[PDB]
Request: fold
Amino acid sequence: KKILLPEPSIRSVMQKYLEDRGEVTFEKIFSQKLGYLLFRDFCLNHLEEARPLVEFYEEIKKYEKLETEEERVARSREIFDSYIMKELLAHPFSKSATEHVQGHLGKKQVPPDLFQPYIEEICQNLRGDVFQKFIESDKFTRFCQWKNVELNIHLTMNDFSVHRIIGRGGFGEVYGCRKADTGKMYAMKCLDKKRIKMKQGETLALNERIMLSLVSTGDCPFIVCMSYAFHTPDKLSFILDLMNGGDLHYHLSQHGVFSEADMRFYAAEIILGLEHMHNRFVVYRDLKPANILLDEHGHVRISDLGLACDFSKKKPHASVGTHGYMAPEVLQKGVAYDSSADWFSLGCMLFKLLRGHSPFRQHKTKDKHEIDRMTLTMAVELPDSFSPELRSLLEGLLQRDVNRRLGCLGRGAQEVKESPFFRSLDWQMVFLQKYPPPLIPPREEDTKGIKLLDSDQELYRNFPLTISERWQQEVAETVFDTINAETDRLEARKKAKNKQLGHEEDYALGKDCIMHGYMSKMWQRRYFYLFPNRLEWRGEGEAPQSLLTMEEIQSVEETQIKERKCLLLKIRGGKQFILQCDSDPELVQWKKELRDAYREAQQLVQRVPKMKNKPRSP
Amino acid sequence: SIAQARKLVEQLKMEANIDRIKVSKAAADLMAYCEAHAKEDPLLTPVPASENPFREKKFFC
Amino acid sequence: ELDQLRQEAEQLKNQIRDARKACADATLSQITNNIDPVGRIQMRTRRTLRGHLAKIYAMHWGTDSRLLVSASQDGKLIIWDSYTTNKVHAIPLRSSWVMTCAYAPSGNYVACGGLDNICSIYNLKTREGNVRVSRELAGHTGYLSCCRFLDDNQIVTSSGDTTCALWDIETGQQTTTFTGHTGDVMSLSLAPDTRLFVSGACDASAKLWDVREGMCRQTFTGHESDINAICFFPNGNAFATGSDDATCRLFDLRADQELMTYSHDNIICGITSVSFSKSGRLLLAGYDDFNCNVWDALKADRAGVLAGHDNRVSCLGVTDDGMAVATGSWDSFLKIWN
Ligand SMILES: O=C(N[C@@H]1CNCCC[C@H]1OC(=O)c1cc(O)c(C(=O)c2c(O)cccc2C(=O)O)c(O)c1)c1ccc(O)cc1
Ligand SMILES: [Mg+2]
Reply:
């Protein structure tokens, strides 16, 4: 059930994998949650020179997070008094840097930027020797243990403990579930594969996967994000954020219309959400309150990302969306569009929260073509009870002309934020989910004439995905601290046991070993050592008494044994040697390093008359 | 080069400036060596089994 | 001018040919025609040394006719006690590509090297007991093919760079260099007195070198293909060569020409190694057909066969006290025969 880290020896393989992808750099690791955490552990507890630097980094980071100006003026001087007079007497800071910093300080002006010069110079001093000392250290070994896991993630229903239904749909239903791995609460969206083929939703389902993917990075509080995606023989599956509060179309039903003051809150959170999708070049195209969801505190998130669309490489032009909330350029035959669309939808939705229906929906009509015709023709008649600053905002959003609409003129999300309507709000505080929410929630056999081909299945071949920072964050806020300690105990115990066993040091050190680690021969698990001219192996006790030479190897291929991917070495003697691995990174690397090893070896021998194969038969 | 060719002539004069005995005398002297030392070559004149490490010898230094 | 010296280059080549023909009054096989044959020598394999995990490329007896070193594709040198099968030392090397090894006459040091292009010297008894490297020898720009000690502080290496070199092991520099061969040098053998040594190359020629003076006294052609191995006759006035053309040849220094050719028609593969017995009567040769053949040196008869390796006999050596022959093979085993 629980995560079991691989052994430290994984480093030999993992390092080479990472180095090949240029992922062993200060920037690449430091900018990762687990990378960061293991790095600071090293500097704080194991290198006295790096300690004050990281201590000071983390102190500046707390300052960046401070709500208001008067809290900062406090912390600003509070900061410059203490650590700084240790750092200036050390590793000095530059005049150039202290000049700007002290310039702002003297005037009593205190932005978050204030210390950014000091951030840069700290990195300069963290990324040199200090980093290379970290790479050598046992903590980078530990990073390599964790990264191995990340890149071996194969999900199935066994991994999740599914609870209750909280949403039906066309192709399947959304559930609520706990990932047994870490005990993190999630929502599982299970699309049935037989339902999908029956409705031809082939690009429709595979679209969502790509759309969820693009929006899930960044750590945003206002969009329902994906952490994983995977599939079983008869089902697709998304792991998404959990929201227990129901949707805003349900609460509109129970609350009736909302005030201006209440609609403002939702619009704020929805806006930031939209901004996030637009900056990453995605148009949502189905903004309605039914697609807006509430957590148990009352805060909201945009959710249903099936109809979403990428607009970077080419701008779309279809009539995608629900008929009450579609911008004029979406409906028109061959007119292209971008983020312009979602702003018109915002008007339509915001309007419905205030008056109980779309502005282009009248007499509770159920005629799609009539509702589309109001959009293109009808000037939106606004009530009198409405405020002036609200009239300001809505007739900006529902403005038919794209060039005359808020959020389209050049600054995008920023034009709407600085509208008169949101004059009271500190927008940072919105993003910090600190404003109080207005509403706090209270506490089949149709597809049996269709078969699943193995041609259909290839369409979802590259379905599975794991969003790195999301998995890393999950782990960080759950099992990470405790599992580090647990495997620290094992690794210390094995070494203590081996010290009693008169530890024989590594067989790889001192020689020209390319890399090494566990693999399984044929299943018999054995530790391998790949040398430039041979591949040895041993069992748990003695030095290698078995091997295979590089010159024997005809080809290194990849083949299936009981639906697990393996390596198929073809020996010159017509024989075959099969290797299995414990992780995908390992499979990728062995394949590579062997292909590189035997080709290099076989050419070197060609030159050597003493090692090459001379003629025999007449 | 001319250096590569003059190197050769100089050498080839060096090799021609050795003196040579007759193959009849040459062979005769080898055969004299074999015959002389044939008593001592244990692959021709075998020794007692107990004195041969690889047969029946028991005591060693 | 270029032509001018290429005519004298063959005028002198012909002066040498006819010089030698004036000595060819009889043949060794004629002189020896009178002596009793050695008769069938049926040597049985008395030890099998098992340890190496892959091909053996090179082996070398210690002066004490008891300990020997072997070098192997498995990245190790091993020093064995032939009398008992015991391993004295399993030395793991720093390069996997070894091709050669060599024991000190003293026995305090072994040496090895390969496609590393370096001749590494190991000290077999440090002031603790842990065996360690005592010197690398970088200098060659080609693979090390063979090497031999004169004493603790002097070694002689041959390389695929096409040269040989005499080293001063303390300083780690070359005292003397032996340019001359025009193809990869493959084996060498020291004259018993050490003042001379000979080499053998892929040019199909062996050369007698003047160790101290540093130059080529004689060149002996006659082979049709790469000469793989070479050995001095105990008295130092003649030597023997092994080649891919499927023959051995005995060359006499003072006669300055070929004396003898050992080659049955049925033997079509190459010779990888050659060594004389204590008296010099027998010539032992290792072959790519898995066999070692024993030749009557004087009569050119095949006196017997050492047959019991599953792959190429890659190397062989007679103990200083003539008690045993060693053969090393691509089957990964050494065997001591007598
Ligand atoms: O998105 C949620 N709930 C939505 C709210 N919107 C109103 C509809 C109910 C529910 O949506 C679904 O249950 C749902 C189920 C599905 O199988 C599908 C689809 O198969 C589907 C799709 O993936 C893409 C386009 C269209 C469809 C479709 O079913 O028509 C869907 O869009 C919604 C949701 C998300 C996270 C969470 O923790 C709790 C709930
Ligand atoms: Mg359009």
Notes: Residues A 166-174, 187, 191, 204, 208, 224, 240-243, 247, 290-291, 293, 303-304, 306 surround balanol (ligand 1) (CB under 6 Å). The first helix of chain B runs from residue 2 to 16. The interface with chain C takes residues 2, 5-6, 8-9, 11-16, 18, 20-24, 26-31, 33-38, 40-44, 52-55, 60 of chain B (CB under 8 Å).
